[PDB]
Each structure stands twice: as structure tokens, then as C-alpha cells.
Design an enzyme around this catalytic site. Structure first.
Site, PDB file in Angstrom:
ATOM      1  N   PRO A 194       0.831  -1.212   0.000  1.00 39.58           N
ATOM      2  CA  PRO A 194       0.000   0.000   0.000  1.00 39.58           C
ATOM      3  C   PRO A 194       0.860   1.254   0.000  1.00 39.58           C
ATOM      4  CG  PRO A 194      -0.762  -1.580   1.632  1.00 39.58           C
ATOM      5  CD  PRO A 194       0.584  -2.043   1.187  1.00 39.58           C
ATOM      6  N   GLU A 235      -3.974   5.236   4.644  1.00 42.39           N
ATOM      7  CA  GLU A 235      -3.523   5.825   3.389  1.00 42.39           C
ATOM      8  C   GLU A 235      -4.291   7.100   3.066  1.00 42.39           C
ATOM      9  OE1 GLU A 235      -0.833   4.671   1.881  1.00 42.39           O
ATOM     10  OE2 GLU A 235      -0.739   3.223   3.528  1.00 42.39           O
ATOM     11  N   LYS A 252      21.598  -4.351  24.684  1.00 43.01           N
ATOM     12  CA  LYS A 252      20.319  -5.034  24.510  1.00 43.01           C
ATOM     13  C   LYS A 252      19.897  -5.753  25.781  1.00 43.01           C
ATOM     14  CE  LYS A 252      18.766  -7.062  20.990  1.00 43.01           C
ATOM     15  NZ  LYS A 252      17.712  -6.095  20.584  1.00 43.01           N
ATOM     16  N   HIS A 289      16.517  -1.957   7.972  1.00 44.69           N
ATOM     17  CA  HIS A 289      16.868  -0.543   8.022  1.00 44.69           C
ATOM     18  C   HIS A 289      18.365  -0.353   8.217  1.00 44.69           C
ATOM     19  CE1 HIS A 289      12.576  -0.772   8.968  1.00 44.69           C
ATOM     20  NE2 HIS A 289      12.480   0.456   8.489  1.00 44.69           N
TER      21      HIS A 289
HETATM   22 ZN    ZN Z   1       1.190   4.709   6.489  1.00 42.48          ZN
END
Ligand code: ZN
Ligand SMILES: *[C@@H]1O[C@H](CO)[C@@H](O[C@@H]2O[C@H](CO)[C@@H](O[C@@H]3O[C@H](CO)[C@@H](O)[C@H](O)[C@@H]3O)[C@H](O)[C@H]2NC(C)=O)[C@H](O)[C@H]1NC(C)=O
Ligand code: NAG
Ligand code: NAG
Ligand code: NAG
Ligand code: NAG
Ligand code: NAG
Lengths: 596, 195
Positions: free
Chosen positions: A328, A357, A463, A487
Site C-alpha cells: 500500500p 492511506e 540489549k 533498516h
Molecule cells: Zn502509512
């Protein structure tokens, strides 16, 4: 004349050319994503190269004007955006090798395959099968194998590559005015020149630290409850005082605990609220799903969708011959064109995603008036925050009953609220320690506080101290544990998620006060309140023109991010966790580990 | 009837040039019938300042001037008495005491192409504001800087003309709009234009 007028004319010319070029690039990308073919790929590549060349040329041109002579609190920001030197200041060989390192990291992350132990039949990619195994499989040995194998597969390969990457990006930052690459990433939150609303690049460090210090009790109590439930599920592997083992968190990296809802369900008897069967019985389709989402923004006072949007946007999966990506996305192509690329089916999750959205598109419509450079969210977090507030409000039982999907007979008990709050807790509260830890580790590495010989040692120690997660199989310096995450591998900033998580609940508290809701924050619907819609539109229209501090002041009455709205949101779960954790130890001990 | 005014020439011209060089057409010595004007396509903006819409046919004028040009959706508002904007000050200025009706209608079907209608142009750089009812077509490289441009483009030297790009997928407000401004003037002569 003055350089200010010269800069003004330059900005006008740049805006009017850049709008057309960006529209061409966006249309090419939309065509490629909707209809994948060689000609479309060639057109998109051509458009992207042309737009990149134009941006480079204009950035080189804009450096003539010193920012000292610019006073207008708008021309200064536009010229700052253009002068950020998208043109690589590095040497030619340095730039080529940096691009090579980025490409190699992306290639290794995407094509990393894990083969079965002493079985060459299948070598699984991370995304399709291994992620599903980690998410749903209840085998301790299988999960430990998957985690360790992926780590050895990607981190060991990428460790020298990540070292070269950090060296080169630190060199780039040193070439620029920023202290390190962490400072370069934090520069987005920086505000200069507006006294009484200013921000410092290092001030983000203090704000994030203080916010986590406030969050820590809730995370500790949720951690104790999840530890008890995972001990019940897996008897021998989990220790009461020790931290949770990594592979049992629910995903490969422990980012999200949503997979733990089945194992840690508070009340099995109470069924979760889901409207799939009701929507099927009422015979809905994606078009009317999006129309119902539109009616919400119409009710809140925001404008409604364009006929061009309805005509051009593909909200239904074409299927058959057509090939397209089903991720999306809300596209602000420019010059009044807004579209959604979503293979929407008749499900509650798809309905909420449609709401998210259309929130994106309402933001894009709101900041359309501002110049092209400022046509973005005030910071990286506000845009998904504006999406997520609408997503949260859409799923409320009051909104569902108003729409009519849920029967008038149903009423919500304590158990339903506790279940919903705990699911959203595993979704939202759990990711905050992981984001905090990852950003702290990466910032320290960029600054150079963490030595190369102690990279992974400090990573796992932090951690264990912060996230309360212990590595199943001990890993030496050859492994590069952060490199596994998407990432980290593809060089994306991660503090955006933390900022979004705080901002969405600050927005929700502000808009619920605007809507004059009485009761818990979770059962808050902003549908018919036109005060909340206007209060939101005040920030939505600004874009980047005003500082993000001023935008946040306008919406929530505060100039700085606060976790008090989040704690007020999860107070019922906090009380329930106090009650359930009376016989369970609170806090975690670092010493315990699965090994030895 | 002896004569009918060439309304089907000012409208339906299939090419309205550009706002920077607006077509100045003189309508005179004919009967002005607004029935055909109403019978044309529905108008996005049909606002009459000096001459009442009801008394359009009743009032008589010596000469009628129609100015045809293509402008964007948001630029329509700038074509009005007392309104200031890029188009209003640098392309075409309606006078302070303008008498007439502004007629606008959508032209996305004809004036938009998938490749792009780069032919239409407008001006966004000029030394001084235009006086009412003025036409400028000469392209001198704008010298915003302190150094002469010498008739070439470069740093602080930009061509004043800039191109609209019209595509079918553009939203309302950036779609090409066809505007023909009817100007009515009284002169010391027989009117010869009565409806
Ligand atoms: Zn979003
Ligand atoms: C920095 O420069 C910009 C211009 O590049 C200033 O922008 C402001 O833009 C608005 C546009 O809506 C101008 O308003 C217009 O005023 C006329 C005259 O009343 C009116 O007819 C239009 O409808 C419209 O409202 C506004 O005048 C302009 N401001 C200035 C001072 O030119 C921006 O304000 C500047 N920021 C500062 C003060 O540092
Ligand atoms: C970008 O690099 C150029 C040299 O190529 C330099 O003149 C300019 O000041 C730099 N801009 C900034 C703000 O770093
Ligand atoms: C939706 O937009 C149209 C214009 O496209 C407008 O006429 C209408 O009033 C808006 N709202 C509703 C409820 O249809
Ligand atoms: C995709 O684009 C091609 C042109 O490159 C076109 O022929 C085709 O009809 C489009 N749709 C599909 C489903 O291929
Ligand atoms: C909003 O207003 C409409 C008006 O018909 C009403 O039907 C609906 O129940 C209202 N929703 C809420 C949540 O009050
Ligand atoms: C909420 O909790 C109270 C205290 O146990 C209980 O008496 C009440 O019935 C509960 N409501 C339900 C069942 O949701």
C-alpha cells in the site's frame, strides 16, 4: 537589488520547473509499479535520472547565496534544503566505493539464503519462508537454528562491509558541517533562527533518553507478563529472573511482539473484534470500503477525495494478466494528483490500512499550497503519525457500531478492553525499547564511542540492559547482529518510529480533548467533532514552513514530545499488569544466559 | 435579422494563444446575442461586473473587445478587478473600473496531451507591473542580478517565459481553463451594437 530578491526569483524558477519534473518522475514510477514491464522500467529510469540531474544542477547553483543574508523564515529553509549538498562532496573514488558498498549491502540482504542443516534441498530467503517460520513455529530448536543461521549468514558477511560503510559515512559527515553521521540524521529535528521554538541536534538525545526513562515501568511490567506466559509455553528455556531469549520474541530481530498475542492472550474465551464476516454478509467491496473511509474525513471536517483520485487510483487488485506490487502507498504525484496503490480485499485490516492511506492523502492535500521544497511533513514522524491516529480511531467499537458493521446488541466488557489494549501494547510499546537500543548503538558507533573491537559486545550488553533480551547462542566479533535488520542494511533512520509512536498518542490526546470525550482514551472516536478536525488541519496545512516545534505546539499545546499521553492511553493495561504481576517478579537480571 | 456578432469566432477558436500574448479581437457593427453564449458549454466562472447579466442584451456599446487566453484553475480568480497575483500583474490586468463579463470553461479535453502542452506560456519575471489592457511579447533575459545578462541565460539570468504543462491526469485547479474576457466600452460614436 538585495540577494534576498535574487534568491526569491531563483526559488520561483526552481519551484516551477521542479514541479513538472517531479510530476514526470512520479508518473513514471506509478506506471512501473502498477504495470511492470521493460518499457515502464526504462521510462522510470530515464525520469529518475533526469530528476536527479536537475536536483544536482539546482543544488550546485543555489550555493551562490550565503544564508546569512536571507531573513525571510521561508527562503532560508528552502535554500538550506537545496544547499544540503546532495552533490557528493566526497572524491570520485570515495563516492564510487560508497555506492558499491551500499549496493553490496542491499544485494546481500536481499539475496541472503539460509539452507537446511546438512540438507541441500532448500535454501530459504529471509522474507518468504524463514519469517513465517519464526512468526508461527513453536519449535525452540528450529527458532534458535533459524536465528543463528541468519546471523552467521548475513552479519558475518556484512561486518567488514559495515565497517567500511561507517568509515565512509563518517568521512562524508566530517566533510559536511555535521559532527558525525548521527548528527547528520538528527539534523532533520533541528530548528534554528526562531527563538522560543528552537531545537538542538543533541537535544533529541536528551529527549529520547528522558522519554524512555518515563516509559520503562510499563515495559518492565509487560516484560514480566510476557516472560510468565512464555515460560508457561516453553517450560525449561525461560528463567524467571533472566532476560528473554532473543529468538522467542516473535520475529527475527525482536522488533515487533505481535506474533505473541496467541501465546500471551489474556482471555481465550473472549473472541477478538473482527468485521470480516459482517462485511461479507453485507456484501462490501474495496470501492465502498474506501468510500466509508472517506466519509470519516468528511465528518471530521476535512475535504473529500477528487474525481481524478477516484478515476486514476487502483484500489482493487487487477489480477490475471496484470502484474503489480501490492504494497500500500499513497502517492502525491504533484499538481493536484493524488492516488492510492493498494490491492484491497474485504478485510478489517485492509479497511484500517485504507484509513491510514487516506490520512496520508489528506496531509498531502493540506500542504499542497506550500512551495515544492516545503511540501513535506514537518518531521519524519508526523506523516505516519497522522496516518496512525486515523487508523486507531477507525477501529474503535463506537465507530464500528456507528458505521453499522457491529450489531447494536454487542457491548464491550473489561475483558475485551484488556485484550485489545494488550495486543496494541505488544504492537506499540514493545517496539520502543528496540528502536531506542538500535538508535543508541548506531549513534554511539557513528560518534566513535563504541570501539570496533567491542561493537557486538556493547551491542548485546546494551540489549541485555535495556531491551531485556539475551542472545541464545553467544556471538563473537565476527558476527554483525545489527546488519541483519532491513533498516540497518539499507541505511534507513530508525528514530522516526519512536517519534511517531509518541506523536500519535499526543495527537490523540489533543484531539480527544477537542472532541470532549469522557472515559478511557482507547474508546475515543473523533468522527463527528469538527473542532478536532480543524485543530488537526491547522498543522496539516503548514507543511515544513513553520518549525515542527510550532506545529506540535499548535496541535497538542506543548513544544516537546511527551509520553504522558501514551501512559494515559495504556493506564488500564498498566493497572491490569500490576494486578497480574503480584506473584511474578518485576525487572530482569542481566547475568542469566541460555549458554552456560 | 441583419447581423449576428462573431461570438462563434471568439469562442471555438481551437487555439487561444497564451496569457502573455492575449488575442485582442474587436467586435463591432453587429447584434450581440448572448443566447448562443449561454448555449455553449457550461461555464466554470461567468461573473459580470459592469454590465448586468440580465441587461447584457438591453445595454448597447460602441465597441466590444474579447480577450482569449488559457490559464490554470487557480489563476482564474486573479482575472478580476482589484485582485493581485502573478498572472494579474505580469500577464494581463483587468482595469479597476472594468465593465464586462469574465467567461471561463474547462479545456482539459482539448488543451491537455499525455506528452504535455508546453506550447502555452506565461510570464513570471518582469521589471514593473503592467498597466491595464497591455500586451508584452518581447523576451529579455531577466537581470535580477547586478551584472548585465548580455542576452543569454545563466546565473541570475532567467528567461521570463515559463511553460504550463497540461496533462489529462492533472487535478482540477491545474487543468487548463479557457477564459474569454468580454470588454464593453462606450465611445463618442453611434453604438451599432445592440442586443
Ligand atoms: Zn502509512
Ligand atoms: C517571505 O516572502 C514571501 C513571498 O515570497 C511572503 O509571502 C506572502 O505570500 C502571500 C501569498 O498569499 C502574499 O499575500 C498576498 O497579498 C496580496 C496583497 O494583499 C493579496 O492580493 C493576495 O491575495 C495575497 O493575500 C503576502 O503578501 C506575502 N507576504 C509578503 C510580505 O510579501 C512571506 O510573507 C515572506 N515572509 C516574511 C514576512 O518574512
Ligand atoms: C557544498 O560543497 C561546496 C563545494 O563543492 C561548498 O562550496 C558549499 O559551501 C558546500 N555546502 C555546504 C552547506 O556544505
Ligand atoms: C464532496 O466533493 C464534492 C465536489 O467534488 C462536493 O460537491 C460535495 O459536497 C463533497 N461532499 C459530499 C458529502 O459529497
Ligand atoms: C502494460 O503496459 C504495456 C505497454 O508497455 C501495455 O501494452 C499493456 O496493455 C499494459 N498492461 C498489461 C496488463 O500488460
Ligand atoms: C455522526 O453523525 C451521523 C449523522 O447521521 C450519525 O448517524 C452518527 O451516529 C454520528 N456518529 C457518532 C459517532 O456520533
Ligand atoms: C469488571 O470487573 C469487575 C470487578 O471484577 C466485575 O465485577 C465486572 O463484572 C467486570 N465487568 C465485566 C465482566 O466486563
Amino acid at each position: 537589488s538585495t540577494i534576498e530578491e535574487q534568491a526569491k526569483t531563483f526559488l520561483d524558477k526552481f519551484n516551477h520547473e521542479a514541479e513538472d519534473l517531479f510530476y514526470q518522475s512520479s508518473l513514471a514510477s506509478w506506471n512501473y509499479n502498477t504495470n511492470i514491464t521493460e518499457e515502464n522500467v526504462q521510462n522510470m529510469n530515464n525520469a529518475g535520472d533526469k530528476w536527479s540531474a536537475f536536483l544536482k544542477e539546482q543544488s550546485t547553483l543555489a550555493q551562490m547565496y550565503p544564508l546569512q543574508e536571507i531573513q525571510n523564515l521561508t527562503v532560508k529553509l528552502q535554500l538550506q534544503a537545496l544547499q544540503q549538498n546532495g552533490s557528493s562532496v566526497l572524491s570520485e573514488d570515495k563516492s564510487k566505493r560508497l555506492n558499491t558498498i551500499l549496493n553490496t549491502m542491499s544485494t546481500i540482504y536481499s539475496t541472503g539464503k539460509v539452507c537446511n542443516p546438512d540438507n541441500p534441498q532448500e535454501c530459504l530467503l529471509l522474507e518468504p519462508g524463514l519469517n513465517e517460520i519464526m512468526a508461527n513455529s513453536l519449535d525452540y530448536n528450529e527458532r534458535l537454528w533459524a536465528w543463528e543461521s541468519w546471523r552467521s549468514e548475513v552479519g558475518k558477511q556484512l561486518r567488514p562491509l559495515y565497517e567500511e560503510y561507517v568509515v565512509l559515512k563518517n568521512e562524508m559527515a566530517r566533510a559536511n558541517h555535521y559532527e558525525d553521521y548521527g548528527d547528520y540524521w538528527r539534523g532533520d529535528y533541528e530548528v534554528n533562527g526562531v527563538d522560543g521554538y528552537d531545537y538542538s541536534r543533541g537535544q533529541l538525545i536528551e529527549d529520547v533518553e528522558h522519554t524512555f526513562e518515563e516509559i520503562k515501568p510499563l515495559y518492565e511490567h509487560l516484560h514480566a507478563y510476557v516472560r510468565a506466559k512464555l515460560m508457561n509455553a516453553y517450560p525449561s528455556y525461560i528463567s524467571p529472573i533472566g532476560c528473554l531469549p532473543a529468538h522467542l520474541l516473535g520475529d527475527m530481530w525482536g522488533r515487533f511482539w505481535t506474533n505473541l498475542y496467541s501465546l500471551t492472550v489474556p482471555f481465550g474465551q473472549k473472541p477478538n473484534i473482527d468485521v470480516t464476516d459482517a462485511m461479507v454478509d453485507q456484501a462490501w467491496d474495496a470501492q465502498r470500503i474506501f468510500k466509508e473511509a472517506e466519509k470519516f474525513f468528511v465528518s471530521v471536517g476535512l475535504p473529500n477525495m477528487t474525481q481524478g483520485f477516484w478515476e486514476n487510483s487502483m484500489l482493487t487488485d487487477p489480477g490475471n494478466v496484470q502484474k503489480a506490487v501490492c504494497h500500500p502507498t499513497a502517492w502525491d504525484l504533484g499538481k493536484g494528483d493524488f492516488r492510492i496503490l493498494m490491492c484491497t480485499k474485504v478485510t478489517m485490516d485492509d479497511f484500517l490500512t485504507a484509513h491510514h492511506e487516506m490520512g496520508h492523502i489528506q496531509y498531502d492535500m493540506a500542504y499542497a499550497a506550500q512551495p515544492f521544497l516545503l511540501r513535506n511533513g514537518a518531521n519524519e514522524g508526523f506523516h505516519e503519525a497522522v496516518g496512525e491516529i486515523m487508523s486507531l480511531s477507525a477501529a474503535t467499537p463506537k465507530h464500528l457500531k456507528s458505521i453499522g458493521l457491529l450489531s447494536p446488541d454487542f457491548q464491550e466488557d473489561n475483558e475485551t478492553e484488556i485484550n485489545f489494549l494488550l495486543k496494541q501494547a505488544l504492537t506499540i510499546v514493545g517496539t520502543l525499547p528496540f528502536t531506542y537500543m538500535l538508535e543508541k548503538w548506531r549513534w554511539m558507533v557513528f560518534k566513535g564511542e563504541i570501539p570496533k573491537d567491542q561493537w557486538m559486545k556493547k551491542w548485546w550488553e546494551m540489549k541485555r540492559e535495556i531491551v531485556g533480551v539475551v542472545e541464545p547462542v553467544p556471538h563473537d566479533e565476527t558476527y554483525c547482529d545489527p546488519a541483519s535488520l532491513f533498516h540497518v542494511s539499507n541505511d534507513y533512520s530508525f528514530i522516526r518510529y519512536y517519534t511517531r509512536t509518541l506523536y500519535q498518542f499526543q495527537f490523540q490526546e489533543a484531539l480527544c480533548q477537542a472532541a470532549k470525550h469522557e472515559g478511557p482514551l482507547h474508546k475515543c472516536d473523533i468522527s463527528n467533532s469538527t473542532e478536532a478536525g480543524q485543530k488537526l488541519f491547522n498543522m496539516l496545512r503548514l507543511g515544513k514552513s513553520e518549525p515542527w516545534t510550532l506545529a506540535l505546539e499548535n496541535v497538542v499545546g506543548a513544544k516537546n514530545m511527551n509520553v504522558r499521553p501514551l501512559l494515559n492511553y495504556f493506564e488500564p493495561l498498566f493497572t491490569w499488569l500490576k494486578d497480574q504481576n503480584k506473584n511474578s517478579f518485576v525487572g530482569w537480571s542481566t547475568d542469566w544466559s541460555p549458554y552456560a | 435579422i441583419t447581423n449576428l456578432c462573431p461570438f462563434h469566432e471568439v469562442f471555438n477558436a481551437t487555439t487561444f494563444a497564451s496569457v502573455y500574448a492575449w488575442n485582442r479581437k474587436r467586435i463591432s457593427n453587429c447584434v450581440a446575442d448572448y443566447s448562443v453564449i449561454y448555449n455553449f458549454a457550461p461555464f466554470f466562472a461567468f461573473k459580470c461586473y459592469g454590465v448586468s447579466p440580465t441587461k447584457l442584451n438591453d445595454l448597447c456599446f460602441t465597441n466590444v473587445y474579447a480577450d482569449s487566453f488559457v490559464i490554470r484553475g487557480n489563476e482564474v480568480s486573479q482575472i478580476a478587478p482589484g485582485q493581485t497575483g502573478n498572472i494579474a500583474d505580469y500577464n494581463y490586468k483587468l482595469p479597476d473600473d472594468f465593465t464586462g463579463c469574465v467567461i471561463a470553461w474547462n479545456s482539459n479535453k482539448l488543451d491537455s496531451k499525455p506528452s504535455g502542452n508546453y506550447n502555452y506560456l506565461y510570464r513570471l519575471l518582469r521589471k514593473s507591473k503592467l498597466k491595464p489592457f497591455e500586451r508584452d511579447i518581447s523576451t529579455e533575459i531577466y537581470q535580477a542580478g547586478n551584472k548585465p545578462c548580455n542576452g543569454v541565460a545563466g546565473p541570475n539570468c532567467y528567461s521570463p517565459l515559463q511553460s504550463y504543462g497540461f496533462r489529462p491526469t492533472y487535478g482540477v485547479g491545474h487543468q487548463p481553463y479557457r477564459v474569454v474576457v468580454l470588454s464593453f466600452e462606450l465611445l463618442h460614436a453611434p453604438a451599432t451594437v445592440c442586443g
